[PDB]
Amino acid sequence: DLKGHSVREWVSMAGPRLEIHHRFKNFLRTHVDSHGHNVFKERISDMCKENRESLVVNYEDLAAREHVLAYFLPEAPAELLQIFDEAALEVVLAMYPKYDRITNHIHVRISHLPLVEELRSLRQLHLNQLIRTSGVVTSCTGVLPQLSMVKYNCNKCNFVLGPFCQSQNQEVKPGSCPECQSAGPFEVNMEETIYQNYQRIRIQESPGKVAAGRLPRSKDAILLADLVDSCKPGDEIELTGIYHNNYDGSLNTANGFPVFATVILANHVAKKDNGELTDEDVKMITSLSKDQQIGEKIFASIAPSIYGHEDIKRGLALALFGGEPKNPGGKHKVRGDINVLLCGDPGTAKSQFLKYIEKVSSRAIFTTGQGASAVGLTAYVQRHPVSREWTLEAGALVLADRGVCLIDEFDKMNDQDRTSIHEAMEQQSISISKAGIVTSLQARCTVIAAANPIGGRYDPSLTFSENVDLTEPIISRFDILCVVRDTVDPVQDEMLARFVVGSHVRHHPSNKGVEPLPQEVLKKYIIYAKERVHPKLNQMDQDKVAKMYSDLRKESMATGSIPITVRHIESMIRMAEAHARIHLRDYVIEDDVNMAIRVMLESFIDTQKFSVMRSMRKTFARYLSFRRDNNELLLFILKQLVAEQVTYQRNRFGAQQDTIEVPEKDLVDKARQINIHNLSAFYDSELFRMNKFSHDLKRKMILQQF
């Protein structure tokens, strides 16, 4: 039955121990299911399938079927768990008699233990009891080999002292050896000893779960033999274990008060989270690849939380997919990485863009030009602060060796950070010559950087290079230079304000998107981008491209501008390969080339001073408007005229007026200048209406509300 004198002593007795053994056997065999399934049967099948030695028992159903054990278990978890382990072992041997050659021990883990105590509320009332806590892993040793069934050598007669069980709370020490009766020295026989995996993790309270004025408390837990490597620093886990006191932690060494250090013998770890498998998932990837508008869908599905900035989104999508690295022979190395530099005046979502890219990609590490980050750009070697291990801290650039290096505050780097980034962007490896280490460990990352312009505001009358605090060697290493530009447009101001205020409304702690194409969910999107397993190749036009570069050279050396160079066509090739990869094509097609030309030219043209930017916008407009439909071109022209008019009004009217208007005729004239001649669809357009525009055919006027 039950009700002896002390639960631990109650279950230590042979009678209740054996009775508990049989009761747990009965529960394992006969706890079928809510619908007649015998969950433990196929659970043991899955365990013994892949040699897993771990049997997770839910607490809810154990308290249902056999509540007496469920009452006993928290009070005496060491003994009850020993009993459960042996009972499960013999049940498994009954089911798979051959399985006894594998590990001869089944670990019963216990899930959903009802009452969860948090790290700060643990007391000595909880000592030697099974508890559930929750927190964040802050530190985690390597897997250590712990003596499990240890055999010794009598180093007086070489007899191998028989296997002793190593408990978790006392160092096993033999007495005499049984042959020569020497009390004398022994040594671990490491060939006949068996070990088990041991890991020591530290878990603190979740920072959100910590109260107002209070610091997070932390505990050490011990993972053993099947639990090791189930946790990583920064993981939020649900840890079930024995709140344990009595091993060797007692300040008896006159250092002060006789306090006991405590540890948790982990029984069960549950990681509370959701990285890539791409199995059977490839057919739907190809299915939406067949969309023939997948490119715009993907451009629309990045940074869904940032309004506007469509061109930056397209460039970041290209960077995510990237081009084709090549090395003709072994003596001419061209990267496939597409590096993006966002230089824009403040509050324009550049930091948000970098944060999103870090979320959506694997092997992305975020670092900042200031000193405000976990990982810096430069390699160094030092004793690690928490692990105390002499480690080569290879910098941010090499930790993202086949991923993305996101560098915020790019204009605020040190001299040595600038040298590190120059070496990584140039040679794609980092050369250490620091302690005694001379090595060249490599860093083939795409660098996406965000910079603020000099003086806090971009000046279109200067070139890109002379309103950013970067040297030409650094700027030349970026395939896309995005000039973000904070200008006061009432319509976009309303749209962005609605966007962000809606965000603030819907995330209020109580209650816990505008494109032609549907956004694509970030999960299938991560998987889609991870379908970079297929390389890609191009055998398409060369006379059009060559003529385009020749014309660009003649213009950019006629006009006193930044000259186009070879690296611009090589970046155009990267962006063409990336665009082909977005469509899974395996061959650049003329539209891939055309879109890459448009992107390369948009990047190259916006980085000129204003006069040159206008001239190049004009002369290369046929290249520059590829897949740029009539509705958006016309909207751009209309915005230009209405802004001209508003400036005219407010210069000598004190403020802009209401019902700002513009004639039909001049819009018609400029639409002819770009050869439209058919404005009717523009007036019927969704885009025309969305921008608070209106067509007044009574007087050939078109006007805005505000």
């Binding site: 897997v143 080999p145 712990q146 499990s148 490491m190 060939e191 000893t193 068996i194 070990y195 088990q196 995996n197 041991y198 033999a225 090791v228 490597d229």
Partner: protein, 49 residues
């Protein structure tokens, strides 16, 4: 294996010029073509192997 190597070296350098009379211990370094395993895979079941 190293004791074997010492014996074989003895019987192939025999006889040795005077001064080289005492036979030396031979260290047997050993290599394989197998692909290396991860440093993370060094669990406890690999101890003493």
């Amino acid at each position: 294996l190293e004791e074997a190597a010492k014996e074989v070296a003895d019987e192939v350098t025999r006889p040795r010029p005077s001064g080289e009379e005492v036979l030396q211990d031979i260290q047997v370094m050993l290599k394989s073509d197998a692909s290396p395993s991860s440093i993370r895979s060094l669990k406890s079941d690999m101890m003493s192997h």
